[PDB]
Nucleic acid binder design. Structure first.
Length: 1030
DNA sequence: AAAGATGAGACAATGGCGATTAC
RNA sequence: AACUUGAAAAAGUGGCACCGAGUCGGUGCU
DNA sequence: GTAATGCCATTGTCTCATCTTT
């Protein structure tokens, strides 16, 4: 019946889950193909695909290549030519009058005379072949074109991507600095001078340098080993950015995108500066002016050189090997090399004024076909094309007949391949592979459900959990924040009580040092060795916004000092402590937003605009890659129309933030422990589906925030009730408190302690449909997380590109044995190397006989790529790593109660919750400490039948008995390390406390030759099982 | 005096080859 | 992934509920 | 006589030391 799909897209895994209307995961029977006695299996519609981030045919298919671009352009030209055919059949001065195509184009925009159709085709073809990028959607407008708005958007993306140590830019006049007629580096230095906290070599400084047209190096900003240089004008920038993102992750993708956007604004401001006419073709006019300056400077240079310096003329115009003018025109010499070569010649000669101010501006003797044109957006070419069509509209009727055709040719980006759409994206090859896998997963899932499309497809871009290498970077940043703030203020608290970066990971201690060792609400000193009695209060309550960052947290002895209101802290405290908050503000100890929230009672208190800001902060996804993935899935899923040109959206693509599902897990103890198995990807997908369906059922009018598409822009300020209960939940007004996840909660604890109550059954106000049942639905979620059968599949992949094995091959044949060469039947795995692959596939029999095999059973040869799956006895599974080695193939389905216990024991000191809640968790752990022994038993019984590494199992059990005296937290943390013994995939060494357990490898592949081979679909729901006993 | 860049050295993870041992 | 058809791009092939839940099982319907 | 059970090789990361630049 009706269902929804939840997706957790990552760079090494893709989680997927299918949910019903009552938030249940269906269990279905699937057919099993092959030649065994198993014809049906029961599987839950939940799982996760796992895959390598490596060199593969698919990977090369997802890379940008010149040929695909070429055929694209060629096709466009073919369309254009078909449009021009019927009229073309009827249809020195040119080269001298127009030495470049931009002259002809400007003539066609500025001439009313009738022109030859061939030249018109030349203009249109030039605008179509190199049409420019599609990063800005719609018509040009100052909101997406002016330098100011895009600079603010860039620094907003920057501050959003970190939110600690951020740069605040309000006083800056981005237009006056960036649009000024000066050199790129001087514009960069002028903008940096206006930002005292940032420097040219910083990340933001390098972004500005990238947007201005320089070549910044991002190694120091990300500590990369290999230098990664980016130039927007360079043709190989996109793949370079894709390489760069692969090293640092795709979270920074939008940052570089914003830099690109800023560049476009500057270019748009550089061409619109000069207006010889009121409205014109700015690009063509700029190229003509560039041509004119080139001609003047050229003739003047030749005149001056011939008059004053007859010598070395040949070195500039004839030699061409040392990057002269002949190398600039006839050789492989870039513009920067030519400038570097001719700068001292211009510096030495007399009468060289005016040429140098143009040279320093990098606009001296420029060509018309240069590296900068990659930055030209397509809206400019679309404007000029519309202009040309309008000028020649009445003269040629077929231009009137074919306006929308040409416009579609320029604007189109029909349905092409999925690979080209994914290749155009701005991301690492890993996330592009994951996106392709996600699309295929969706296709198979809708195939599995009888070709019924889901009602909702919720997408989360899975966050990369801390790799611990960054766990020290964060401590370093907060340490620099504490040291700069203390040095700025002048209170030597660090002298009397020294601390190191290791201890600063604790929230309360970091807040203690962030607040100069003083209470935020009261004028008294805090007790250094009584922080457990002190509470961490939220400036903006959790009932309004779920913000647990340092930006919205304060440390105080009691949160009753905020006063009686459920809003920001009262005016009686704000008026008294505003001076101290201003001292903490100007010392860069806190951000501007935290001071604004702290001093919000002076401006009335929380307002509808603040609540609207909270709703937009919680509900909208900033990541562009996510929007493009949602666009791909929406376009492939929704393809119906009506009589008009309106898109019927049968399937809603919901985009969710990871913070929502994470907080949902933390609030209702649906805890995630990634180290147990790979089920947590699928679980995250399920919880995403649940949260997404709940939100779209609860707030349909807020669809424009999450659902992808063109909806009615529903304002959020007007939908807020005036009163808590009188107008909230009794009228059309959807909610008074701005936190969207309140309806999941049974109780709502405000900042004073009053406990607000919410109905047992949450229903939609307009349609009267129950959206959440606080009993049955949480029980259902727990039951789903408790299911032991979740489909974990390792994508088998041929290797492409000692020799590397492309794939292994099962050969059943005979080999000669002994002096007499008696033929003996054998069945063995042979590794086909990458160099050997083509020869083996050309004629397998000849290759095998050259290897020594005889009487090969051609029809029994089986191709076995890496990770091919085999099942043996008692459900034990192995994956093919090689021709002579196997990997573990099973997942340890630990019950939910033990997962939650492990999360709680390992999260002993770090809880980030209320004191009562913390006491409940602590008493739960202590009352359930026997779960440690039970988890060990589970590891033992799983390992006994599935792993068969008895030396390591004995080592493990021995160490666990050795350390049963240790604290619960440590034993939990080391059981977390113990789950690598049982994880799916390659065996790996690990540690229980200090005792190291070395990997037990499966160094023989013999047993798989008589096991059951399992070929698996991308989702693992469809499988074929072959009993290799034969 | 502090920060950035380049090269080399211990880590980490997985697979392959050779020698010793066991059936 | 496997299988079928194709030189290839590429097309096709795997029933639904309920009671449970140790890697999925059982029962009813079809 | 054949097959099963420590060190080396390859691809990526990270940290430390020295030299150069702001």
């Amino acid at each position: 019946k009706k269902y929804s799909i939840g997706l957790d897209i990552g760079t090494n895994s893709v989680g997927w889950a299918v949910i019903t209307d009552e938030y249940k995961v269906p269990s279905k029977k699937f057919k099993v193909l092959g030649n065994t006695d198993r014809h049906s299996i029961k599987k839950n519609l939940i799982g996760a695909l796992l895959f390598d981030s490596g060199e593969t045919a698919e990977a090369t298919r997802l890379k940008r290549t010149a040929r695909r671009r070429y055929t694209r352009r060629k096709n466009r030209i073919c369309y254009l030519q078909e449009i021009f055919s019927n009229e073309m059949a009827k249809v020195v001065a040119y080269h001298e009058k127009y030495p470049t195509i931009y002259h002809l184009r400007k003539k066609l925009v500025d001439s009313t005379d009738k022109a030859d159709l061939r030249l018109i085709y030349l203009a249109l073809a030039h605008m179509i072949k190199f049409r420019g990028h599609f990063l800005i959607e719609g018509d040009l407008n100052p909101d997406n074109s002016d330098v100011d708005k895009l600079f603010i958007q860039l620094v907003q993306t920057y501050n959003q991507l970190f939110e600690e140590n951020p740069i605040n830019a309000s006083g800056v006049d981005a237009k006056a600095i960036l649009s000024a007629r000066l050199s790129k580096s001087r514009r960069l230095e002028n903008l940096i001078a206006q930002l005292p906290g940032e420097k040219k070599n910083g990340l933001f400084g390098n972004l500005i340098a990238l947007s201005l047209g320089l070549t910044p190096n991002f190694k120091s900003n990300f500590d990369l080993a290999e230098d990664a240089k980016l130039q927007l004008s360079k043709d190989t920038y996109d793949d370079d950015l894709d390489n760069l993102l692969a090293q640092i992750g795709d979270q920074y993708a939008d940052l570089f995108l914003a830099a690109k956007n800023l560049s476009d604004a500057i270019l748009l401001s550089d061409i619109l500066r000069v207006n010889t006419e009121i409205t014109k073709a700015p690009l063509s006019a700029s190229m003509i002016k560039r041509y004119d300056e080139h001609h003047q400077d050229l003739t003047l240079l030749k005149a001056l050189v011939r008059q004053q310096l007859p010598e070395k003329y040949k070195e500039i115009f004839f030699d061409q090997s040392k990057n002269g003018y002949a190398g600039y025109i006839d050789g492989g010499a870039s513009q920067e090399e030519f400038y570097k070569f001719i700068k001292p010649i211009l510096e030495k000669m007399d009468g060289t004024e005016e040429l140098l101010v143009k040279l320093n501006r990098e606009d001296l003797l420029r060509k018309q076909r240069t590296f900068d044109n990659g930055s030209i957006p397509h809206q400019i070419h679309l404007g000029e094309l519309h202009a040309i069509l309008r000028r020649q509209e009445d003269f040629y009727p077929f231009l009137k007949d074919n306006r929308e055709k040409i416009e579609k040719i320029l604007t189109f980006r029909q349905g092409d391949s999925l690979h080209e759409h994914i290749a155009n994206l701005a991301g690492s090859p890993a996330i592009k592979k994951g996106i392709l896998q996600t699309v295929k997963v969706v296709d198979e899932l809708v195939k599995v459900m009888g070709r019924h499309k889901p009602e909702n497809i919720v997408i989360e871009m899975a966050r990369e959990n801390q790799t611990t290498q960054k766990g020290q970077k964060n401590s370093r940043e907060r340490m620099k924040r504490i040291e700069e703030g203390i040095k700025e203020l002048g209170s030597q608290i660090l002298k009397e009580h020294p601390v190191e970066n290791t201890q600063l990971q604790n929230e309360k201690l970091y807040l203690y040092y962030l607040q100069n060792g003083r209470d935020m609400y009261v004028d008294q000193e805090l007790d250094i060795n009584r922080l457990s009695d002190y509470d961490v209060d939220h400036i903006v309550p959790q009932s309004f916004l779920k913000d647990d960052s340092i930006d919205n947290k304060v440390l105080t002895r009691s949160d009753k000092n905020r006063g009686k209101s459920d809003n920001v802290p009262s005016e009686e405290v704000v008026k008294k402590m505003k001076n101290y908050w201003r001292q903490l503000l100007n010392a860069k100890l806190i951000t501007q937003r935290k001071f604004d929230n702290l001093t919000k009672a002076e401006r009335g208190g929380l307002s509808e605009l603040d609540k609207a800001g909270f709703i937009k902060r919680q509900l909208v996804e900033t990541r562009q890659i996510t929007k493009h993935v949602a666009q791909i899935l929406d376009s492939r899923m929704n393809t119906k129309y009506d009589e008009n040109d309106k898109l019927i959206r049968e399937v809603k693509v919901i985009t969710l933030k990871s913070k929502l599902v994470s907080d949902f897990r933390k609030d209702f103890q649906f805890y995630k422990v990634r180290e147990i198995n790979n089920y947590h990807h699928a679980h995250d997908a399920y919880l995403n589906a649940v949260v997404g369906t709940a939100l779209i059922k609860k707030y349909p009018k807020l669809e424009s925030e999450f659902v992808y598409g063109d909806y009615k822009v529903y304002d959020v300020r007007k939908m807020i009730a005036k009163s808590e209960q009188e107008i909230g939940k009794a009228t059309a007004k959807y909610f008074f408190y701005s936190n969207i996840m309140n309806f999941f909660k049974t109780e709502i604890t405000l900042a004073n302690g009053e406990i607000r109550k919410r109905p047992l059954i949450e229903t939609n106000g307009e349609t009267g449909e129950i959206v959440w049942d606080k009993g049955r639905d949480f029980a259902t979620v727990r039951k789903v997380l408790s299911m032991p059968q979740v489909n974990i599949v390792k994508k088998t992949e041929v290797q492409t590109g000692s020799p590397t094995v492309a794939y292994s091959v099962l050969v059943v044949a005979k080999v000669e044995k002994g002096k007499s060469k008696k033929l003996k039947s054998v069945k063995e795995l042979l590794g086909i190397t990458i160099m050997e692959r083509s020869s083996f596939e050309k004629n397998p029999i000849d290759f095998l006989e050259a290897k020594g095999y005889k009487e090969v059973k051609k029809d029994l040869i089986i191709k076995l790529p890496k990770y091919s799956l085999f099942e043996l006895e008692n459900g034990r599974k192995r994956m093919l790593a090689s021709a002579g080695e196997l990997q573990k193939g099973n997942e340890l389905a630990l019950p939910s109660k033990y997962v939650n216990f492990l999360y709680l024991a390992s999260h002993y000191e770090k809880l980030k919750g209320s004191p009562e809640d913390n006491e409940q968790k602590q008493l739960f752990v202590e009352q359930h400490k026997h779960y440690l022994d039970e988890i060990i038993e589970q590891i033992s019984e799983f390992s006994k039948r599935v792993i068969l590494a008895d030396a390591n199992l004995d080592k493990v059990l021995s160490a666990y008995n050795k350390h049963r005296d240790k604290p619960i937290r440590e034993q939990a943390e080391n059981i977390i390390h113990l789950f690598t013994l049982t994880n799916l995939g390659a065996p790996a060494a690990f540690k229980y406390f200090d005792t190291t357990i070395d990997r037990k490898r499966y160094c023989s592949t013999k047993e798989v030759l008589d096991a059951t081979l399992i070929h698996q679909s991308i989702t693992g729901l469809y499988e074929t099982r072959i009993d290799l006993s034969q």
